[PDB]
Curated annotation (Swiss-Prot):
Keywords: Capsid protein, Helical capsid protein, Host cytoplasm, Host-virus interaction, Hydrolase, Inhibition of host IKBKE by virus, Inhibition of host innate immune response by virus, Inhibition of host RLR pathway by virus, Interferon antiviral system evasion, Manganese, Metal-binding, Ribonucleoprotein, RNA-binding, Viral immunoevasion, Viral nucleoprotein, Virion, Zinc
Biological role stated in the UniProt entry: Encapsidates the genome, protecting it from nucleases. The encapsidated genomic RNA is termed the nucleocapsid (NC). Serves as template for viral transcription and replication. The increased presence of protein N in host cell does not seem to trigger the switch from transcription to replication as observed in other negative strain RNA viruses.
Name of the molecule in the record: Nucleoprotein
Molecular function GO terms recorded: 3'-5' exonuclease activity; identical protein binding; metal ion binding; RNA binding
Assembly notes: Homomultimerizes to form the nucleocapsid. Binds to viral genomic RNA. Interacts with glycoprotein G2. Interacts with protein Z; this interaction probably directs the encapsidated genome to budding sites. Interacts with protein L; this interaction does not interfere with Z-L interaction. Interacts with host IKBKE (via Protein kinase domain); the interaction inhibits IKBKE kinase activity.
Ligand binding (Mn(2+)): D26, E28, D166
Gene Ontology biological process terms, A to Z: negative stranded viral RNA replication; RNA-templated viral transcription; symbiont-mediated suppression of host cytoplasmic pattern recognition receptor signaling pathway via inhibition of IKBKE activity; symbiont-mediated suppression of host cytoplasmic pattern recognition receptor signaling pathway via inhibition of IRF3 activity
GO CC field: helical viral capsid; host cell cytoplasm; ribonucleoprotein complex; viral nucleocapsid
Location within or outside the cell: Virion; Host cytoplasm
Superkingdom field: Viruses
Amino acid sequence: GLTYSQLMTLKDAMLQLDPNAKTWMDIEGRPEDPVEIALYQPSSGCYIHFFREPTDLKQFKQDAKYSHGIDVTDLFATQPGLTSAVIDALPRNMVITCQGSDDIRKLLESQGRKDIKLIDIALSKTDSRKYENAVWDQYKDLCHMHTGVVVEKGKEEITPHCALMDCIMFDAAVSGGLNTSVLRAVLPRDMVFRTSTPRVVL
Ligand SMILES: [Zn+2]
């Protein structure tokens, strides 16, 4: 769980979202056990992005091989309870656009956010991954957490799925290109991860 000071820091951070602007949301991992969560407002450029340690390591390993390619050891330092804290702090009656709403539905509903409405924009495999190369080429420095080799079931190597890149590239398909806004993280780096570097005299 988050400290009281962090919860107040989160609330002030969540204020940067426009409750009536177009907001994308995508997750990696199943809604009952998500490991990467991203929200994206292309108008203001704000984006929410954080990670979570998985509960089902067996399901995580299969999800890593065929989807996100995340090393589980990179998730040991994630802030616990951050998923519930961020979902609790989302603006009320917000409308969220997503590709595949039924799992975004399960996640938000498990946290009691029935006020949030979902727009299930569905796209082809061609349209959803249309700007995949352009988005990764432009924003690869926003997520270095996809270190494993991902294959698609014969098996051949594909580009790993990132919840943040998915939001950007799905919006790129609908809007027909990359948005000109400069992307800015809403969540502080020290709220997403807990520092593993001990204070040492040198
Ligand atoms: Zn990612």
